[PDB]
Design a protein around this ligand. Sequence first.
Ligand SMILES: [Mn+2]
Ligand SMILES: [Mn+2]
Lengths: 60, 580, 290
Amino acid sequence: YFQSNMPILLFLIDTSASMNQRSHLGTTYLDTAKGAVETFMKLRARDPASRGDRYMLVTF
Amino acid sequence: DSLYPIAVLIDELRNEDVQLRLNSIKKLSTIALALGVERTRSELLPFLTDTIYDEDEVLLALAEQLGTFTTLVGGPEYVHCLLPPLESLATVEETVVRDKAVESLRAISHEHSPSDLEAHFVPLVKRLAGGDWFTSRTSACGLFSVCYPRVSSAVKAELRQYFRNLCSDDTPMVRRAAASKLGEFAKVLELDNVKSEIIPMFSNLASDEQDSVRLLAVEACVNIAQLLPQEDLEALVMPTLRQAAEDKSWRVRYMVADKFTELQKAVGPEITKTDLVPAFQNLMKDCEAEVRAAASHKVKEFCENLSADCRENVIMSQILPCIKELVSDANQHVKSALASVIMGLSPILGKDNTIEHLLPLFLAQLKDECPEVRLNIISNLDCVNEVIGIRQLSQSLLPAIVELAEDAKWRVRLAIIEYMPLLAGQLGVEFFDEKLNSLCMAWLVDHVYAIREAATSNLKKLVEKFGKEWAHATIIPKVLAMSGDPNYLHRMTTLFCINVLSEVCGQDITTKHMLPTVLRMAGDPVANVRFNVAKSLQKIGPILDNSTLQSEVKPILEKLTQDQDVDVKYFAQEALTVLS
Amino acid sequence: FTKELDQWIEQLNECKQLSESQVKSLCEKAKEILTKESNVQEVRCPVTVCGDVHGQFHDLMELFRIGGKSPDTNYLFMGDYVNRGYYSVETVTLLVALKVRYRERITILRGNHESRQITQVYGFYDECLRKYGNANVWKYFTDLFDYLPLTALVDGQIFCLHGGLSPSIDTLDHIRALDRLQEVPHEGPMCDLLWSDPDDRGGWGISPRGAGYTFGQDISETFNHANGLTLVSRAHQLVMEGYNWCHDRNVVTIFSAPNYCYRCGNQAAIMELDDTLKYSFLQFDPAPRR
Ligand SMILES: [Mn+2]
Ligand SMILES: [Mn+2]
């Protein structure tokens, strides 16, 4: 009746220009955020339930 | 005590590093030499046999070692003691170890004398063929060909019986090994015994359920046909070849196709005329592309080997329409396979037949989209040239090959370059200048270096044919223009052209036209051009007049031998020595 | 000494390996030659730039037939001479021999496969064992790989390199300041130069590989502007057409290994740069093998 087995992962990435600040890594905050989303999905993919996950992207 | 080489110092080397184990096995000769030969046979070889290891490379090295162990075991007399450990190696799951063990077994077979072969080797073969595991059974197949020639007749009949049983075994890979080794095994047998024992089982192999065994049967079909007398092939081999050529599996038909020429050679021409040409026909007209390509490459070899009295009739009545349909084949590999051999039919058919029938087929393949087709067609242009002369070449094929001098793939252009001397040698100065001289010049500025090199080498032959006045009027001005080019590749190309041109242009032209251009390139900014100038001055030194050496060539080489680039220094000083 | 080197080059052109002692002496000479080279080698303008060869010896012979013979043609090789090929030993030995014989005509950079771990995993070690029976030749070559320059700089404009750019590297002075005498690390400035790739993204990113970064067009634009470069020549990635322009002509990838793993069916290209930096890519197909 309702599919709760397909979770929605909405990512609200801050795209304000303040996210151009550079860490000690030499990458920007936005680069860290993109890498964080990628790492999040790499970690999520270990779970077999990760199939059917809806990934969404909204910005500022 | 820990000093016995046999057990101790060997079973301690089972460390994680495999390379140490291979090193121990590689140097197994030294431990054996340290031990007494009687002690070796008593203690070393039973240890090798009884113990079982589980590393493929060590086992392979061990099997390779045992093939040369006859000197360190007590000579050929006691060589039978090497049979148990190799037997243990012949029963392993890994196939490569099994093949190496069989190779070692048949290598030490020669060391045995007939009596020992009957006493020890033949029971070993019986055990291997009679083993519970199929691996030993396949291993036994390769052992028949070396034990057979040097045993008694009763033992030979026994060997025939066990090979027949092995061939008729229920296990597939055993049948595969038996079919693979059937050709080698039947080589040494008696001919009547071949007919009685080998042939019925061979025909049974060709009619088996599995397709790989049938493939190996057709593989062995060539040797089996070659062995037999010609009066027997209509009833023994030919029905089997007819069965095989119509097999459902395309692999069996394919490997029939590659073996077709050898079948033709073996069975004799009249049998081929009667029975092989429909088999060849429906192999070329077959549905599968692989078998069509396999048959296409055998067309020249097949047709050339027929009887000349009935040869051309066979070709035009059966082969030629099938060729016409293959030239327009959908698959490019079939067309390429046909292209590599199609020009070979020109001397066979004759001049008029080639013009009326083969020449449109050449033209169609010369304009094919596939580069392999175009490349394979041009490579055999000398044959059609010698057959139809050059008037027909200029009429029919010259516009097509001129279009191929600008081909996308450079190997096509390389073939055209390689075939320019022939045309030049068979055509006049006027016609060549009208059509082909610009083509010869267009290649000197090609992107590919191999094309430029081939064109440079081709200029030497062109000057040899058409004289040096023609070179001074047509060749030299377009070469000298390349010296002023901003790309250093083209300047180096002129240096290479001068290298090959000084030899044929003579003393005067080299001295007054080519040398001043060579000398002015010593001030080039590219070091590559500079040391190639040094190389050229070395090379055109002999064919220059001796008066301008010390006056003109020597100062430039002296300036170059103190240059800043080390390579320019080296080649300049090498030139200085060669000038003497 | 030079005659013997010429004999080795003639022999190696026919795909016959050298003996262990020959490889030892060759790598000794190559070490003493590669000590003097900077991390950012300076290459004069007329040069041919080649990408990965990866041990495909006959494809290297096709490359020489296309671009020309050394020393007549100046060559810049951007690493990855070993692994994924059947003739890694012959390939790397010929390239090292050409470097020793023709010092100023050959530039051989370090690829990401010029390391002990990658060679151990991906078949250069296995090939050395098969062709020599001991790992001493592998030891000599891997010790020599530490000596290879990281990057080159043609005319001061074109920045040849194997992998790409690093978040920690902003200038060429940083590259010149690196200590390249070491095994390539898993993380750090030296790893990215051999492991990074360009991407159609914004800014930096995590490489799909286990090492390096992936960088967008703005990264290469800022790098080129800050370092006065007009182009970043590159290798390290399969290109179906042999070469590909990226980042609005700021980066070009060059792959010189046609039919890369003998299955990819790719073309191979080489960037021929003439005296006046006018480039031209020579695409070529794999050689006909007997
Ligand atoms: Mn790479
Ligand atoms: Mn690579």
